[PDB]
Amino acid sequence: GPLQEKDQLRTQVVRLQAEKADLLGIVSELQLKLNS
């Protein structure tokens, strides 16, 4: 279905946005441990 396809794509985006947020925090922290 197209709405089931729509909701599954909406849920995908949310999950990818959540992973991106965590990875960005991880990048910022690793860069700070390096500048030491």
Partner: protein, 177 residues
């Protein structure tokens, strides 16, 4: 397959609220959002353009402007090959602070990093606080290229990034030869 021939790391810096995220949002996805969501530390977008028949991957880092995020954002300067310095033509304070952002670049980025000043929100004519002439003169004082932009009306956003990327590529090609 590898999808690019050059990879340029770009940074956007400037006071909170000047439109760094909106400028990038226009460039990377051709969209504008009026609702302010201040950036938490750092954000990241990719766009691959073409120059001289070559694929140029732009990894673009959108820093937060608030001083509370200084420690986090400063650590992104080191690898940058081009930096957009953004102020708000309706906010004279954000323009005054461009001199301090330049000093931040010179303390933390490579000496030969490519630089560009953007006077953003040029569509808000009725609230302009910084003339275009003053923006040109500040840029001239520093030997830095300058453009006024509008993320909202899509003015000079393409021009700004393509110009900065062209300057990085020109330098890199001269270093090869």
């Amino acid at each position: 397959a590898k999808t690019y021939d050059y990879l340029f790391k770009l940074l956007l810096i400037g006071d909170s609220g000047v439109g760094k995220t909106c400028v990038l949002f226009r460039f990377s996805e051709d969209a504008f959002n009026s609702t302010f969501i201040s950036t938490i530390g750092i954000d990241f977008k990719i766009r691959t353009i073409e120059l001289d028949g070559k694929r140029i991957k732009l990894q673009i880092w959108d820093t937060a402007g608030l001083e509370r995020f200084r420690t986090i954002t400063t650590a992104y300067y080191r690898g940058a090959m081009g930096i957009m310095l953004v102020y708000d033509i309706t906010n004279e304070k954000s323009f005054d602070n461009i001199r301090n952002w330049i000093r931040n670049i010179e303390e933390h980025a490579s000496a030969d990093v490519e630089k560009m000043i953007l006077g953003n929100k040029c569509d808000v004519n009725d609230k302009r606080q910084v003339s275009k002439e003053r923006g040109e003169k500040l840029a001239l004082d520093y030997g830095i290229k300058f453009m006024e932009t509008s993320a909202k009306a899509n003015i000079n956003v393409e021009n700004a990034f393509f110009t900065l990327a062209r300057d990085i590529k020109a330098k890199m090609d001269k270093k090869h030869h």
